[PDB]
Every structure is written in structure tokens, then in C-alpha cells.
Amino acid sequence: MNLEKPDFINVCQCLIFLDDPQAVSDILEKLVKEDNLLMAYQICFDLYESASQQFLSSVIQNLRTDQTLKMIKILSGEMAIELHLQFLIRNNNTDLMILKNTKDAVRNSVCHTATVIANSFMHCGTTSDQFLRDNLEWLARATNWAKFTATASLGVIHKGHEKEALQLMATYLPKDTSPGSAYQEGGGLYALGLIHANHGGDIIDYLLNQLKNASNDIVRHGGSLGLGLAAMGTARQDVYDLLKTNLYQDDAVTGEAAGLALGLVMLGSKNAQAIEDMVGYAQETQHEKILRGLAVGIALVMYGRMEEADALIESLCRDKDPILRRSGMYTVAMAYCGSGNNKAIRRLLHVAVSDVNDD
Amino acid sequence: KLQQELEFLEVQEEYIKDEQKNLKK
């Protein structure tokens, strides 16, 4: 850091090893003031690339309060996402023959859903729905089960394009179009979340507002999933309270999405309150959907801890419930990922090999 | 370089030897 020439790599990287968001904000401010375009701009993108949540946000907060506006925009990353979108549009590659042989492999089983998802994976970020629209029209005979996966496909093709994809998905208003096929609305909310992935703030706000003002039947699944996707790691009070209300109301049908959204909003926070709430609700309730969503939540509640996760998972993955075992090991695995943590690998392989419990 | 490379490789291999041995019982 103290080398006379402010070379990009060392000062971008050592500061995040030492966890100095204030120091990197200060150096970014000095670069902005001196208006060294290359140094400031490249160091800001390198901070964005190498840093993570709770770090980039802290640095941008301390930077906001000559190129300050540019640094704020590029740390927000909307320009980087736009570059990724335009590259996907340009160098996007599609296979019509594969679309057709997947349509041939379409059968009465879940395989037709598989074909739609594969075609949309190939057509991710195309901003053009003719082949996929025709495929969905051809497969628009088995609904009330495949709407969720079809709207997932529509979300992945039009992800991060709220300028027009928002309207393209809002063209599917559920109430008038199909009251009987109740997954219409859930798929609408789910595609809204998937499309507005990597988008927060106002996205989080209008997701949570329509989730407050709506039914609790099917919309809540996709709504909570999209809300967590938009507020990943944020753990802001309003979405946290909505998710806690949904969880503790015992609405089991949506408790899965509620737990998934809890995990997303407490992504990496290592919130002891959150983990204790999740565990207690686990013993309180006995629904499989609740257990799986809560398993997701406990899975991504924390990562990179190496100080509390070991004891926490020794307590939780040992617990009575196989879902608790699976979620606790999820937590320890993604919390000791990045290094060969001997104790974490020890607990992981031991629970792999000793107990006969299939989960 | 190779010093800590071999240190970590030995740590992981000695761990996995014991862990996989734990299944003999």
C-alpha cells in the first residue's frame, strides 16, 4: 500500500486481505481528487471485482459521504451489468436444431419442462422471444405444474432487462387471464424476481410492497424469492419483518420461500439471532416445505466465518432432524469454502461416511 | 512455493487417510 507508485493490484488486494474499507475509500478519494483516470477507474473496478458484500457497500458509503459520480456508478455496477448484457446480445449463440430436437424429446413427463429450461439456458439474454414463445405455446397444455419452470425459463432469457422485460412479463396479468390456473400469478412474481435479479433498491421496494398487498396463495412463493434475490445480503428491516411474519404465521405453503428469502437477506451476515430463530422454528414446525426453505436459509445465512461456524454446525448438523443436518453442513461447507479448512472437511466427510442417514 | 505446497498437501492427505480409514470399522 505504501509503495510510492500507486500500482493497482497491490493496493486493491492487500486492503481487502487486511479488511480496510475505510482505507480503500480514502485512497479512492485521493485518486478522484488527483483525477488520475487510469488509476482511479481501474482501482475502483478492481475493488468491485475482488471485494464482496459488506465491503463494497461500506467503501461506497464512505466515498459518497472530480470522478466521484463515476466511481459510485461503477461500484454500483450497473454499467458492468449493461456491458455484460450487450455482450450477451452480440456474442449470444443459439441452436435452432437443438431447440427442435428438445421439442421432439418433449414428452408427458417433466422432460418437457427440462426442454424448455435447456432452450432458455441456450437463449439466456437474447431479448427476443419467437422460438421460445412458440415452444411455450406448444407446451401450453400442461399447466398448474409447469408454469413455475416455464416462468423460470422466461426469467433467465430476459434477466436484467427491466427496461423492456418488465413489461414483457407484466403482459401476463393473472386475474383476468386465468383464475383457475392459480400458478399464473406465482409465475408472474417469480419471473419478475428473476428478470430484476442483480437489481436492488427500488426493485426491493416494489417487490415488498406488492408482496404486502397481495394474496397469500401462490404469489408469495415467487414474490419472496424475488425479494430475497433483490435484497441478497441486505437484511433490511422491512423485508426482514415481512419474512419473519410469513415464517412465524406458520403459512407452510410459502414457508419454503420465506426461509429462502431469509437466507438471501442474511447472506453471509452470520446473524446469531437469525440462526437461532431458524433453528427454533425448525423444532417448532414439521412441514417438508418449511424444512427445505429453512434449510436453504440456514445454508446461506453465513460464509467465511471460521470462528463461530465450526461450533454452530457441530451443534446443528448433529441435531435430530436430517434437514437440519443437511442445512448445517451446507452452512459449514460454504463458510469454509475457499480454503482447505481441516476441521470443516473433517466434520463434512465424517457426516458423509459414518451415519447411514441418506439426507 | 513448494514448501507450503507440500505442507498443505500432506495435511490434506494425512487427514483424508484417517477419515477414509474411519470407515473400516
Partner: protein, 287 residues
Amino acid sequence: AVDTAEQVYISSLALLKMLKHGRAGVPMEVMGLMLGEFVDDYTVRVIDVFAMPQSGTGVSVEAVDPVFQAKMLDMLKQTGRPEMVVGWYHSHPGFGCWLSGVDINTQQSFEALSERAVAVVVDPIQSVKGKVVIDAFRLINANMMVLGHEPRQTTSNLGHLNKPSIQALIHGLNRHYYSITINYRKNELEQKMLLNLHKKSWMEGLTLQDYSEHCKHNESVVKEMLELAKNYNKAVEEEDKMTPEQLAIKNVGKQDPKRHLEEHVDVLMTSNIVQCLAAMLDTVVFK
């Protein structure tokens, strides 16, 4: 018309009632109804089940007496815990995981009454040592097949370990809608109680049994291992110089080195040392 990868939380006491009722009426194909409640669409939970005597008529809806069922339900409400009727069970010694025609008819009547009224096949005679069969399905109307068939919904859970039997496949049931997934309420305060208390051997590890049958047992062990001596002999003169695996594949003898492996000798050694250690521990206790 929604039937996802549904799961039945069946209870251990329901299992015990099933096995007792079947063991009693092995050849009568005794009937009963599975006392469960749809807490939601697919997470069905059954805590209790009752046993009813099949009438002389056979499998009939009137055999399950309505007044008797109502009185039983009132008795359960007064003493115990009330529980709804959304299922039925039947010991089925004849053939496997499917339903007979009369079983299908009475299950259709039960479906008209209830919302699902799952059809559960439990074979009492096929369950002998490790495999008890409890397969639940739903009867469907003609519209499910003319719409997108395989009413199995869009998920990757009911495809896990879903192996319907051939007779179930050739019959409509287990083929009309889907096969339900089973689960056991292995809750603690219950499962820990069972494992701690039922399978009870607690001061029974102090048995000595030095030579109660063990002198003649050792004589028999010596005779068996003399047979092993002859076998391992035979092997060492077989021992051909043409990659002895080639000789062994075509001249398997199931000898001491091959099949009567060191595991059996280890069993003999463990028996001997266990009796030795028990005797010696009690000898040093004898003070």
C-alpha cells in the same frame, strides 16, 4: 386435481396396528380405514389407525359399519385425540401393490365421500424380515388421461425411488395418478423412547457362559477347521502355474481361502475371547 410429490407421515403405532390386524386376519383380507387428516394438499399425516372386522359379505362398504364407525369416532373424541378419515388400509395377501376390482370400487366410493381417500396396499405375508410394503395411490377420472397424463406434478421428488410393481403398472392404481411417498414420524420423545426402551439389553452383557455348550462347540469348531485344513490343503496343491485365478474361476470350491474366509475364524476367535474376558472379569470381580 393437484397431486404433487405427496408424502404420508405415518405413525409407528399405526404400523403396529396394521401388522397386528394382518397377523390376526391373515387369510380373511381384513379391512380398515387410515385415520389421517389433510393438514394441506400433499403433506398428509396419519397418527392413528383402527382395525375393523371384515363382514361375512367380504369387501363391502357396508362391512365398515357406519354407526359403529361413528361410535368409534365419538369414543376417540372423548378419550384420546380426534382424527379425520381421509384414507384406508387393507392387508392384501393375494397379490401385490395394486387393488382388486372390488377394492377399486370401494376406493371409488371412499374418493366420492372424502377428497382423496388414498388407496393403500399393505401386504401382510410378503412383509417377513426387512421389506414391508405400504403403497398409496389415487383413483382418477377419465379427464386426467385425456389431459396431460402422468398427473405427477413438476418436481424431482416423487421420481426418487419410484418403482411401481408390474401388477400395479398393469392395473390402473399406482398408474392412474402417481405413487405417494412414505415417511415415518421418527420424532424424538418417541424415537429415542423406542430405541432406549423397547430393544432392551442393559445388564444382559454380563453373561459368562464359559462352557455351557462350548466344549462340544469347540470340538465342532475343530472339526470344521479340519475341513478347512483339507480345503486349504486342496488349494495349495491346486495352486497352478497358469495365473491361478484362471484355475480358480473354473474350479471354485468355496474353501477357507475363498469363501469360508477369515471372517468365520474371526467369529470363532471372538466367541472364545468373549467367553474368556467375561470369565476373567468376573474372576477379578470375585473378591
